[PDB]
Amino acid sequence: ALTPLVSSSAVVSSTIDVLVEVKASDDFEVAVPNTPLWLPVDSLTERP
């Protein structure tokens, strides 16, 4: 931050959410495919 988020507490919340998304750039590359790090399932649950 550089400045506090100065606002009129009189009519607006003095705190706000900031959302962050990511995607890959153009130059993005991967390689060496093998056993994956992740493994997919049809459901996940606690054991009895």
Binding site: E29, A31, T35, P36, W38, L39, P40, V41, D42, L44
Partner: protein
């Protein structure tokens, strides 16, 4: 710049289409004669726990374990095209070395794994491969679908039998003379996935060796090592 990929890797990969032509293992059976549901793309149901003296993770496969194929497929809603099938033997039975894979289409039969009972399904597409001479059995499977667009892991139903439109209404009948057999599949040449959704429900794989509850890691996967040594 495609320099790094040529200087270090020696290849460069651009679509999962490329990847899913690599054959990965799916499921194991003890049945000499088995009915397998080719276009089943489900994955196991998982169970986690923190409590002492309990195996941390546990996996209930409905139709098999995650292949590259299914692992990828999870991301998409639809599929079309055909698939390949690879088969490995516990036993190279010198005097009965043969394998039959046959096209199985019985209408009433249910679309999940089951041992062969039918003795009366004459005149079907039969491929034969010799376990002794050619170590592995290799097969290709037409999409043979009632529709142009099928669904990833379609919820099968009790008497969806083998005529659900949401898949190709076709299964494998595999009759070997190895007690134990190891199944794997990649996608065929013409195969394609459709309508990307997001990440699928998933958990670390490297994590499946967790045993911090003292109770040792039980859950194993169908790999060659695990199969061939029993």
């Amino acid at each position: 710049d495609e320099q790094p990929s040529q200087e270090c890797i020696g290849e460069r990969i651009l679509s999962f289409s490329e990847l899913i032509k690599r054959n990965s293992w799916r499921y194991v059976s003890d049945e000499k004669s088995l009915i397998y549901p080719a276009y089943a793309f489900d994955n196991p149901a998982a169970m986690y726990t923190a409590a002492d003296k309990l195996p941390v993770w546990t996996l209930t496969p409905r139709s098999g374990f995650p292949t590259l194929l299914t692992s990828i497929g999870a991301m998409y809603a639809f599929y079309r095209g055909g698939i390949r099938l690879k088969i490995v033997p516990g036993v190279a039975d010198q005097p009965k070395p043969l394998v039959e894979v046959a096209l199985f289409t019985m209408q009433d039969q249910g679309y999940i794994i089951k041992a062969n009972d039918y003795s009366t399904d004459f005149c079907s597409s039969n491929i034969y491969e010799n376990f002794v001479t050619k170590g592995i059995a290799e097969v290709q499977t037409p999409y043979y679908s009632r529709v142009n667009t099928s669904v990833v892991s379609a919820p099968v139903l009790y008497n969806a039998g083998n005529i659900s439109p949401l898949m190709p209404n076709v299964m494998y009948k595999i009759t070997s003379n190895s007690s134990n057999i190891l199944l794997g599949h990649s996608a065929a040449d013409d195969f394609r996935f459709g309508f990307l959704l997001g990440a699928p429900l998933a958990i670390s794989a490297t994590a499946l060796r967790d045993n911090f509850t003292g109770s040792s890691a039980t859950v194993s996967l169908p790999t060659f090592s695990n199969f061939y040594l029993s």
